[PDB]
């Protein structure tokens with residue numbers, strides 16, 4: 001159980017940080033990076 | 049009177065070493081120029097200009 005939650009916490013942080021690190025540039029620096037994603041996009045928002 | 053008796057009248061440019069060359073930037077015109085600049089502090093310095101980092105958050 002501890003490995004489940006420590007690992008799950010690790011994997012959540014790694015997956016979240018890896019996807020955030022790979023966001024394709026679609027905005028400026030005066031806007032949130034979240035704005036680069038439009039709900040319903042057919043294309044990928046980060047480079048796997 | 050002449051002399052050349054108790055001294056050796058050798059001909060040369062008095063430098064900080066018995067044999068060496070004046071640095072190119074030390075001509076010898078200034079008073080006290082003995083060709084002494086091993087660190088080259090008076091060597092004409094060369095600098096590079098870097099452009100202004102872009103810090104516009106609208107870009």
Ligand code: CLA
Pocket residue numbers: 001002004005006
């Ligand atoms: C750093 C040390 C450490 C770590 C990482 C853990 C980690 C864990 N412990 Mg442990 N423990 C520790 C030290 C530690 N323990 C020590 C020192 C002791 C002795 C004092 C214990 C004694 C202990 C006991 C007795 C138990 C644990 C249990 C657990 C697990 C509970 C988490 C879970 O399964 O949630 C599970 C999710 C739930 C239990 C509820 C889910 C939510 C329901 C389904 C719905 C609720 C919705 C809500 C009410 C409404 C919200 C609506 C809205 C407000 C959003 C977990 C993996 C428990 C376990 O193993 O699980 C059975 C267990 O009972 N530990």
Ligand SMILES: CC(/C=C/C=C(C)/C=C/[C@@]12O[C@]1(C)C[C@@H](O)CC2(C)C)=C\C=C\C=C(C)\C=C\C=C(C)\C=C\[C@@]12O[C@]1(C)C[C@@H](O)CC2(C)C
Pocket residue numbers: 084085086087088089
């Ligand atoms: C300003 C200075 C002295 C000033 C001192 C003063 C006013 C003292 C004041 C007082 O004492 C009184 C009167 C009375 C006391 O009761 C009180 C105090 C207040 C204590 C000396 C500078 C002192 C400066 C010095 C010694 C500089 C040395 C620089 C050198 C040697 C550089 C040589 C070279 O640069 C060349 C030429 C060629 C390079 O390539 C190689 C190197 C070797 C680097």
Ligand SMILES: CC(=C/C=C/C(C)=C/C=C/C=C(C)/C=C/C=C(\C)C=C=C1C(C)(C)C[C@H](O)C[C@@]1(C)O)/C=C/[C@@]12O[C@]1(C)C[C@@H](O)CC2(C)C
Pocket residue numbers: 054055056057058
């Ligand atoms: C009467 C008197 C005499 C002084 C004599 C001196 C200075 C002799 C120097 C004598 C010094 C001598 C001879 C030095 C000579 C050095 C030379 C030529 C050296 C050199 C070189 C070489 C070799 C590197 C290379 C080449 O050859 C040229 C040269 C030049 O580059 C002094 C009197 C008083 O001192 C009292 C006794 C009490 C005080 O209170 C009052 C007063 C009046 C000051």
